[PDB]
């Protein structure tokens, strides 16, 4: 098994050179072609391009010069560099490995995590977390909901974990919604038995990556 | 019948005549030292041996 | 029939292709057209050979009684005969068609090298290691034009003429 | 080079129902189509290659039939986990292009939601902003109305809404209606409620809370 | 042009031939020798493949009574197995022999081309689409001499070297 | 395929080889490498084809009584059908493999010729009938160097250049 992780800035200003780096673990770059993939919003994927160490690169005819792909066999990474990014260039990015020849032609089995690249003149504004206390008096039996509000942040990528990943069921982390201020509000809720609350931990860990913020907060009745 | 039990998959669990429905015959003496029911003596179950 | 020189472990994107070396560097690059034709043909061949061997409904064995002995030997003979026939067919077809697959691949090699021969007659010099040295400068665009079968001989005919005559 | 028509854009089908997604191409692709199941917010997972080749570890319910320009992906028995967006890729020639994707939903029994209200955090109130949340969990279908009643008065707007995608296990939806007030944040501190109207409710349900 | 480029609908007097173009005009003309050999071979091939299938006298079907069910299934198996076997043989040989027929025709093309090439090595320059452009003038008599295997290379070697060395 | 004209009743030491003619006289000499490969291949081929036939023995006929006419006809049908199937397999394998054997040998011819041509790219001149005329002196050591695939082109490149260009 080979793993492909992805590093991107999160925000690129509307006339800058996007630089993305896919890190490769479990394989040598000099032995595989490496592929970049793109997804704007929730519409269709698009093969960016392919590059190889002792070979010839080929990129989307749609995006030729702007795209330059490079390889660090030292760092075991391959980088994608896009000149003069645009608003249309705002999308999710995926890096994939081009496998060797099989009887069914060339396959791309191994896929990256996906990193959002946002092309905006605004800054990486950090989030503010506010706890969502339950319905203490009104008892609906076992159902007791607890949450947090991650609000007033500009970049999209926010991660909410519960008990640093321990709370695994009934989690309904909602989609982030654009408010009137140009910032994003993001609610996260877990349903929990009313009995466990007595001696249960309920601490949200929220990691907004471009602002590089890791705020954790309790949710007490 | 092996040819027929090759290529068949039935649920065969039924019965017809009574053991004693037959008239004026010993209807319960089917003991044989060949079909010994373990320590006791008996005969095939699907078949009644009439005297 | 047999057309082999040597293999490339570094070309990992196709059965057949090119190794280019110009002033912009060197690299391996598979020919997707001939490789594609070969994969199509081999897939169709394999599927035809396999799918022709279809299966009927025959509980194979039979067990006959003491008054049906010759019946029984006839039935065992039939079982073993179908066994031998299908075994014979499978063995021979596999042998023959592995031979033919390798020969087909060899002829694909030969046809690709003939194509590159035809695009480049006197503008390059053939080498016994099945390669070409240009009597002119073939950049990346020239290489790609040769790879997609659109090389321009009059474009470089004069430069190649000059250098070729220069050798002697 | 090769434009992609993937019909139909959106589907919803009950469990066990066969599903057929058609992928038509601009020119000839022979049998060089791939098929990927992109689950929500995750990397796409290659379902089928070579058009008629099931990848290792894929349920045998997935079948692929077609050569040339037409192809069809067929799920024999649609299961809960098969909710995703399905793409068809072309590697016959460059540039490799995908279809627009087909959105496979699951028709299920109409399920009533569970509603929970979250008041605004006083910490947030100190920053000059205020937001109340209505919560609807595990309902079907997505189509419900969550209205707001500040002192029994329908506010016209000031409320945004976010819907979780279909749970893979239950295939039940969840919705959050966030009331964000602007400056009347501190000019209310009043009574608040959540008119919840869903098909799975004979009569609407309204929950409410008081100032602090 | 077996797959290089296309065929000739105007040449209707044989499988293989030439398209000549000289001062006296242009026209198609079939090569009767190679076409004749190909007809001979394909005829013998078709006749051999078909006529090789002779079977013994059989009244096919059998019906066996209720105490001969094993006897029965064996006969149905034999009938259907001979069916499968002759079907398999016919299918495979049709596929293989159509393959080999197309390949035989390709090889005949190749041999004719190489014959015309060996006749004219430096008196003509190869045009990449199975053609030759003369450095000299090949009148109707010259064309016919090329066609019936009797081209005279020293006859035109003088004029061809002159025109060649000037052209190049 | 690419067959030839002529035969060499004098070469008595191998399938394939050379006829050399230099200052030191002339003579036939068989190429032991390619003939050795061809004999290996044909031996392995004959052995595979025959070995597949080798299967089990069985007393063929059966005798049935007057109340068994039908299983008797079925048994004779089975015997006779296996007879036909094996006969047809043997016949077609003989025919097709003699075909392919002649083709294999033809291809060995072609391979040997192209090897020699690659060694003597320009230093010699293709006669056409299947030979080479040297533009330089090729004495017995030179002949042997060509025969075992180690000809030295730069060794005679200058002599061949002078003579070749003296012709024109």
Overall description:
This is part of a larger assembly, with 1 copy of chain A (221 residues), 4 copies of chain B and 1 copy of chain D (212 residues). Chain A contains no helices and 19 strands. With 221 residues, chain A is mostly beta strands. In chain A, the strands form 5 sheets. In chain A, strands 2-12-9-4-5-6 form a 6-stranded mixed β-sheet, with no helix packed on it. In chain A, strands 1-3-8-7 form a 4-stranded antiparallel β-sheet, with no helix packed on it. The relative contact order of chain A is 0.17. Chain B is low in regular secondary structure and 51 residues long. Chain B is built from 1 helix and no strands. Chain B has one helix at 2-5. Chain B is flat and about 40 Å long. Chain D folds into 2 domains: 1-108, Immunoglobulin-like, CATH 2.60.40; 110-211, Immunoglobulin-like (Sandwich). Chain D is elongated and about 70 Å long. Classes of the chains: A mainly beta (221), B little secondary structure (51), D mainly beta (212). At the A-D interface, β11, β13, β14, β16 and β17 of A face β4, β5, β9, β11 and β12 of D. It is classed as viral protein/immune system. Keywords: VIRAL PROTEIN-IMMUNE SYSTEM complex. The entry is titled "Crystal structure of chimeric hemagglutinin cH11/1 in complex with broad protective antibody 3E1".
Largest beta-sheet details of chain A: 6 strands, mixed
Helix-strand pattern of chain A: EEEEEEEEEEEEEEEEEEE
Topology pattern of chain D, helix = H, strand = E: EEEEEEEEEEEHEEEEEHEE
CATH superfamily placement of the largest domain in chain D = Immunoglobulins
User: Number of helical segments of chain A?
Assistant: 0
- Tally of structural domains of chain D: 2
CA(first)-CA(last) distance of chain A: 45 Å
Secondary-structure map:
This is part of a larger assembly, with 1 copy of chain A (221 residues), 4 copies of chain B and 1 copy of chain D (212 residues).
Chain A lengths: L2 E5 L3 E2 L5 E8 L7 E7 L6 E6 L6 E2 L7 E6 L4 E6 L8 E8 L2 E2 L2 E2 L8 E5 L8 E5 L11 E10 L4 E5 L14 E2 L5 E9 L10 E6 L4 E6 L3
Parallel strand pairs in A: 2-12
Antiparallel strand pairs in A: 1-3, 3-8, 4-5, 4-9, 5-6, 7-8, 9-12, 10-11, 13-14, 14-17, 15-18, 16-17, 18-19
Chain B lengths: L1 H4 L46
Chain D lengths: L3 E4 L2 E3 L6 E7 L7 E6 L5 E6 L3 E2 L7 E4 L4 E6 L8 E7 L11 E4 L8 E5 L3 H5 L3 E10 L4 E7 L2 E2 L4 E6 L8 E9 L3 H4 L3 E7 L6 E5 L3
Parallel strand pairs in D: 2-10
Antiparallel strand pairs in D: 1-3, 3-8, 4-5, 4-9, 5-6, 7-8, 9-10, 11-12, 12-16, 13-14, 13-17, 15-16, 17-18
């Amino acid at each position: 098994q080979v793993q492909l992780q992805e590093s991107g800035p999160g925000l690129v200003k509307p006339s800058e050179t996007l630089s993305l780096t896919c890190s490769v673990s479990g394989a040598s770059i000099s032995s595989y072609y490496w592929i970049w993939i793109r997804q704007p919003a929730g519409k269709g994927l698009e093969w960016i391009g392919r590059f190889y160490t002792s070979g010839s690169p080929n990129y989307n005819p749609s995006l030729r010069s702007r795209v330059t792909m490079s390889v660090d066999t030292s760092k075991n990474q391959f980088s994608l560099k896009l000149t003069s990014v645009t608003a249309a260039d705002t999308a999710v990015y995926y890096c994939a490995r081009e496998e060797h020849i099989t009887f069914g032609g060339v396959i791309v089995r191994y896929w990256g995590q996906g990193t959002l690249v946002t092309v905006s003149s605004a800054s990486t504004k950090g989030p503010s977390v506010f706890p969502l206390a339950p319905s203490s008096k009104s008892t609906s039996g076992g159902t007791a909901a607890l949450g947090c509000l991650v609000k007033d942040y500009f970049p999209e990528p926010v991660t909410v974990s519960w008990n640093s990943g321990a709370l695994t069921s009934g989690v309904h982390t909602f989609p982030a919604v654009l408010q009137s201020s140009g910032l994003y509000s993001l609610s996260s809720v877990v349903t929990v038995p009313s009995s466990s609350l007595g001696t249960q931990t309920y601490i949200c860990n929220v990691n907004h990556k471009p602002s590089n913020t890791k705020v954790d907060k309790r949710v007490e009745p | 019948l092996r040819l027929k039990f090759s290529g068949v998959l039935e649920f065969s669990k039924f019965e017809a005549f009574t053991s004693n429905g037959w008239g004026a015959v010993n209807s319960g003496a089917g003991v044989t030292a060949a079909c010994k029911f373990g320590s006791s003596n008996s005969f095939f179950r699907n078949m009644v041996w009439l005297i | 029939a047999g057309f082999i020189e040597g293999g490339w472990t570094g070309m990992v994107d196709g059965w057949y292709g090119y190794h280019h070396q110009n002033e912009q560097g060197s690299g391996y690059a598979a020919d997707l057209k001939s490789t594609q034709n070969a994969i199509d043909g081999i897939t169709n061949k394999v599927n035809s050979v396999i799918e022709k061997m279809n299966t009927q409904f025959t509980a194979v064995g039979k067990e006959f009684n003491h008054l049906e002995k010759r019946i029984e030997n006839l039935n065992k003979k039939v079982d073993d005969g179908f066994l031998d026939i299908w075994t014979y067919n499978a063995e021979l077809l596999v042998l023959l068609e592995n031979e033919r697959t390798l020969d087909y691949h060899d002829s694909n090699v030969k046809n690709l090298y003939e194509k590159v021969r035809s695009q480049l007659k006197n503008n390059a010099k053939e080498i016994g290691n099945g390669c070409f040295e240009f009597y002119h400068k073939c950049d990346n665009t020239c290489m790609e034009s040769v790879k997609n079968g659109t090389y321009d001989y009059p474009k470089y005919s004069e430069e190649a003429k000059l250098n070729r005559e220069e050798i002697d | 080079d090769i434009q992609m028509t993937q019909s139909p854009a959106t589907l919803s089908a009950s469990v066990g129902d066969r599903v057929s997604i058609t992928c038509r191409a601009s020119q000839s692709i022979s049998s060089w189509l791939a098929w990927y199941q992109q689950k929500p917010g995750k990397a796409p997972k290659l379902l089928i290659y070579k058009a008629s080749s099931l990848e290792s570890g894929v349920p045998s319910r997935f079948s692929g039939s077609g050569s040339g320009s037409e192809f069809t992906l067929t799920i024999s028995s649609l299961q809960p986990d098969d909710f995703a967006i399905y793409y068809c890729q072309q590697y016959n020639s460059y540039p490799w292009t995908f279809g627009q994707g087909t959105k496979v939903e699951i028709k299920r029994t109409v399920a009533a939601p569970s509603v929970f209200i979250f008041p605004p955090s006083d910490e947030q109130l100190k920053s000059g902003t205020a937001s109340v949340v209505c919560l609807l969990n595990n309902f079907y279908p997505r189509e419900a109305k969550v209205q707001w009643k500040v002192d029994n008065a329908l506010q016209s707007g000031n409320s945004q809404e976010s819907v979780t995608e279909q749970d893979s296990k239950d295939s039940t939806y969840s919705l959050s209606s966030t009331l964000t007030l602007s400056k009347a944040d501190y000019e209310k501190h009043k009574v608040y409620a959540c008119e919840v109207t869903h098909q799975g409710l004979s009569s609407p349900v309204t929950k409410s809370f008081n100032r602090g």
